[PDB]
Design a protein around this nucleic acid. Structure first.
Ligand SMILES: [K+]
Ligand SMILES: [K+]
Ligand SMILES: [K+]
Ligand SMILES: [K+]
Ligand SMILES: [K+]
Ligand SMILES: [K+]
Ligand SMILES: [K+]
Ligand SMILES: [K+]
Ligand SMILES: [K+]
Ligand SMILES: [K+]
Ligand SMILES: [K+]
Ligand SMILES: [K+]
Ligand SMILES: [K+]
Ligand SMILES: [K+]
Ligand SMILES: [K+]
Ligand SMILES: [K+]
Ligand SMILES: [K+]
Ligand SMILES: [K+]
Ligand SMILES: [K+]
Ligand SMILES: [K+]
Ligand SMILES: [K+]
Ligand SMILES: [K+]
Ligand SMILES: [K+]
Ligand SMILES: [K+]
Ligand SMILES: [K+]
Ligand SMILES: [K+]
Ligand SMILES: [K+]
Ligand SMILES: [K+]
Ligand SMILES: [K+]
Ligand SMILES: [K+]
Ligand SMILES: [Mg+2]
Ligand SMILES: [Mg+2]
Ligand SMILES: [Mg+2]
Ligand SMILES: [Mg+2]
Ligand SMILES: [Mg+2]
Ligand SMILES: [Mg+2]
Ligand SMILES: [Mg+2]
Ligand SMILES: [Mg+2]
Ligand SMILES: [Mg+2]
Ligand SMILES: [Mg+2]
Ligand SMILES: [Mg+2]
Ligand SMILES: [Mg+2]
Ligand SMILES: [Mg+2]
Ligand SMILES: [Mg+2]
Ligand SMILES: [Mg+2]
Ligand SMILES: [Mg+2]
Ligand SMILES: [Mg+2]
Ligand SMILES: [Mg+2]
Ligand SMILES: [Mg+2]
Ligand SMILES: [Mg+2]
Ligand SMILES: [Mg+2]
Ligand SMILES: [Mg+2]
Ligand SMILES: [Mg+2]
Ligand SMILES: [Mg+2]
Ligand SMILES: [Mg+2]
Ligand SMILES: [Mg+2]
Lengths: 76, 24, 50, 101, 150
RNA sequence: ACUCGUGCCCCGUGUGGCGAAAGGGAAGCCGGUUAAUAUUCCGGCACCUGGAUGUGGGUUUUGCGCGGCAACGCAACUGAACGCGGAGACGACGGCGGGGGCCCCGGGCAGAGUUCUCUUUUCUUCUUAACGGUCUAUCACCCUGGAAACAGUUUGUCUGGAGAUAGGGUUUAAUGGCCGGAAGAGCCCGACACUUCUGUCGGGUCCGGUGCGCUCUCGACGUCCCUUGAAAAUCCGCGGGAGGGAAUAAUUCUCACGCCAGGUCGUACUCAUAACCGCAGCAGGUCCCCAAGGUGAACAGCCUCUGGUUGAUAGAACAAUGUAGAUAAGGGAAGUCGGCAAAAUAGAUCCGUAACUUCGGGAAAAGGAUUGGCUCUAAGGGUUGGGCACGUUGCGGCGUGCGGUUAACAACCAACUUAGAACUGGUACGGACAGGGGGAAUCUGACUGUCUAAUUAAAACAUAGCAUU
């Protein structure tokens, strides 16, 4: 797994043919939002502190991608 | 570098040259 | 041991397929003289030579 | 200075008249130790009673909830209620007395 | 009723030894119908199979003796079995002292209380068996600077 | 290259196979799952080799990259024959330093045990993988400069005009800190459902210290030798400059991402007072890894935790003679071939110690004294602070010009080891365990070592030294 620094590169990663899916994980105790995209070789993570760009970023993603919300206590 | 490593690179060049001929 | 070769593995398979009693209908044929199996082997009694 | 509050709830045994709060409040006053000595409960600990079978405690020093739980069990053992009542933590800084099954 | 299989399966599910598995004495017929690992889990949730607690082993007496010896209570001549060098080796005493004395001389020379010519001479005096401890070295420095004053 | 195999052209000193499941060697980790398999199945997240190949980026308008005084750095950044070098690749022992795991101490949140009396008490959980990114970490190397009033410096005396101290830099080496993986996992509590099928929902999962401690690993030093402690496969760099290539495209760019595949055999279970060999379910024999608390010098003996057993034909009675364990008044080897067997001594601290001698020893020679409990006293360490005068900086932190050696002060932190005094008891105290009897002489082999598996361990054999062929 690898980390992505800025937002512009993370958007360009999600516009790739081998991008299978994406998900959103939020940690309320430490007030973080994590965006993860599943590619052929690696899983890319982007970490955000605020919450006024998360929905802005969410609508900027390509519409054909599948985005989930990572429920607590995922079933086996 | 080892000889097998170098043989692969010249083999690709020969294929590309015959294919670019076939293209032309 | 767990480490085995294929030849020894083949031998062990045959030795346990040859270790069952005779069927019941054999004993009802005309002119039969076989009572039991005279070549029964047990891992605690007789050692097979590889 | 930082103040902490602790609450002990004994409504059910109080309503059934098997556990009384006045003795429990008396038991806490001359038993809690401050700086290694008993009876030093001065302007550091408050032992007020809310009234509805609940005791409230205010601390200005470093006091631990487990210390209070240790004292409550000691009181229950003395009165021989140990076979029916257990002390359980339901939330932060509150301890409740419940009946067995 | 034979419950050997159930006790073996319970230990694996509970993650304990078979000496810590408790089977309800009044439900042996119900327990004997559990043959799978799934059924063992359900009987654990319902409270017919529990894990017992460990046996007590406390260090109260151990750390009580340790505190009494910090004030010299159990260290007489009738309480020693090894030799003096076995209890406290001389090489460790020497190594500590040299590191202490060499640490001081670097400190003084850096601040300015002494110069390199006095530093070098005291260094080889400490390598010899001259100064017994830190106090002896400091007193010697003061007298040396007092006479150097004149 | 073949029209299509047939045909051409170079180099040449050399030219087989088998032989290691402990030697050498490309690449996988965590969680879950079964009546019985799992680093192999399920979920998630990676890596290696081989083969094809396209985008992005890089180089080149005069052809094959820039930067730094330098050690060298950067995502790339042509390189045939022939040749040179490095890795694979190596002994035993000693003390010292860094890192991971275990042990130990203090605080906090949950749960449990005890409670006539005491105990802010006793016990348990509080976790973080492979694979990556980023900042660091001994040795060593580079630049400035020029040392005797010689300096630097290790527990252990090495280093320096063949260039030290000092100031500034470069670099080999994470089982170190932070981030991705990753809390969504695992673990601990609580509240409701549920014949079963089925489950559902709330909380928590922190912060410090200590060490001649145990175990593994890494590093710099040192000692020993008439003893100096494998080979091959495989992978890389360099010297050389053969061949090839753009001005609109070219590029055999060891850079990023992307496409495809990885055959064959073993894998259950035991490894031993019942799964092997001794005729057997035989007190015998048979190569390794992991290794908790107390006492204590200690892997000694003795008691305990995790884990594991409660299996060896039983019931009743207490004669002789036995096998195993022991104690005896007074005398003390009178017994016997012969002190055979048993008894006596024994730890630690302080005194004291002969003849002889190859000067190294004899030596723990011989012979004496002390040792519990409680209440105190003294000694042996670490970290952080130091006064003015200018200028900048959200009490500034510093660029400085200075002055000075607090007649060494203040605050905080931490284990152990050693020495002294008073009091006290049916004079006892290495209170169990553990634990040398000593001396004066003769014969014989110098010493340490070796042999008759199953009646002889010795004065017998070997040995260094000496001599001869
Ligand atoms: K091998
Ligand atoms: K299976
Ligand atoms: K390009
Ligand atoms: K470049
Ligand atoms: K080797
Ligand atoms: K070490
Ligand atoms: K260590
Ligand atoms: K450690
Ligand atoms: K320890
Ligand atoms: K690995
Ligand atoms: K010199
Ligand atoms: K030493
Ligand atoms: K070892
Ligand atoms: K060229
Ligand atoms: K297996
Ligand atoms: K196995
Ligand atoms: K085996
Ligand atoms: K021990
Ligand atoms: K022991
Ligand atoms: K008898
Ligand atoms: K008898
Ligand atoms: K005699
Ligand atoms: K005689
Ligand atoms: K003694
Ligand atoms: K004689
Ligand atoms: K000998
Ligand atoms: K013999
Ligand atoms: K002998
Ligand atoms: K012999
Ligand atoms: K001689
Ligand atoms: Mg010495
Ligand atoms: Mg071979
Ligand atoms: Mg091997
Ligand atoms: Mg590949
Ligand atoms: Mg080259
Ligand atoms: Mg991590
Ligand atoms: Mg790192
Ligand atoms: Mg230097
Ligand atoms: Mg993290
Ligand atoms: Mg959790
Ligand atoms: Mg098994
Ligand atoms: Mg075994
Ligand atoms: Mg046996
Ligand atoms: Mg046998
Ligand atoms: Mg000890
Ligand atoms: Mg009997
Ligand atoms: Mg006897
Ligand atoms: Mg007698
Ligand atoms: Mg007598
Ligand atoms: Mg006598
Ligand atoms: Mg004897
Ligand atoms: Mg003596
Ligand atoms: Mg003698
Ligand atoms: Mg001899
Ligand atoms: Mg013999
Ligand atoms: Mg013998």
């Amino acid at each position: 797994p690898q980390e992505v620094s800025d937002i512009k590169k993370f958007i360009e990663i999600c516009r790739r043919k081998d991008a299978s899916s994406a998900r959103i994980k939020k940690n309320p105790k430490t007030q973080q939002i994590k965006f993860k995209v599943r590619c052929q070789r690696f899983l890319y993570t982007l970490v955000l502190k605020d919450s006024d760009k998360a929905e802005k970023l969410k609508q900027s993603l390509p519409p054909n991608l599948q985005i989930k919300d990572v429920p607590k206590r995922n079933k086996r | 570098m080892r000889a097998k490593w170098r043989k692969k690179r010249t083999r690709r060049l020969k294929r590309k040259r015959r294919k670019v001929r076939a293209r032309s | 041991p767990s480490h085995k070769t294929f030849r020894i593995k083949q031998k062990l398979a045959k030795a346990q397929k040859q270790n069952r009693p005779i069927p019941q209908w054999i004993r009802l044929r005309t002119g039969n003289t076989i009572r039991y199996n005279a070549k029964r082997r047990h891992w605690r009694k007789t050692r097979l030579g590889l | 200075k930082v103040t902490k509050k602790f609450i002990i709830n004994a409504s059910q045994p109080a309503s059934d008249k098997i556990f009384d709060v006045s003795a429990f409040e008396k038991f806490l006053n001359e038993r809690i130790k401050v700086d290694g000595r008993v009876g030093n409960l001065g302007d550091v600990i408050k032992i007020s009673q809310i009234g509805d079978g609940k005791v409230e405690i205010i601390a200005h020093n470093d006091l631990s909830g487990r210390y209070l739980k240790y004292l409550t069990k000691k009181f229950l053992k003395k009165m021989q209620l140990r076979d029916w009542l257990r002390v359980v933590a339901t939330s932060k800084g509150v301890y409740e007395l419940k009946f067995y099954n | 009723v034979n419950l050997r299989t159930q006790k073996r399966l319970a230990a694996s599910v509970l993650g304990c030894g078979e000496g810590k598995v408790w089977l309800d004495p009044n439900e042996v017929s119900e327990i004997s119908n559990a043959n799978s690992r799934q059924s063992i889990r359900k009987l654990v949730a319902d409270g017919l199979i529990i894990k017992k607690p460990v046996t007590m082993h406390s260090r109260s007496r151990a750390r009580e003796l340790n505190l009494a010896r910090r004030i010299g209570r159990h260290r007489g001549f009738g309480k020693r079995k090894g030799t003096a060098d076995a209890r406290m080796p001389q090489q460790v005493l020497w190594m500590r002292r040299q590191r202490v004395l060499r640490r001081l001389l670097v400190k003084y020379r850096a601040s300015g209380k002494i110069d390199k010519h006095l530093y070098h001479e005291l260094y080889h005096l400490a390598k010899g068996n001259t100064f017994k401890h830190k106090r002896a070295l400091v007193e010697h420095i003061h007298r040396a600077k007092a006479e150097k004053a004149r």
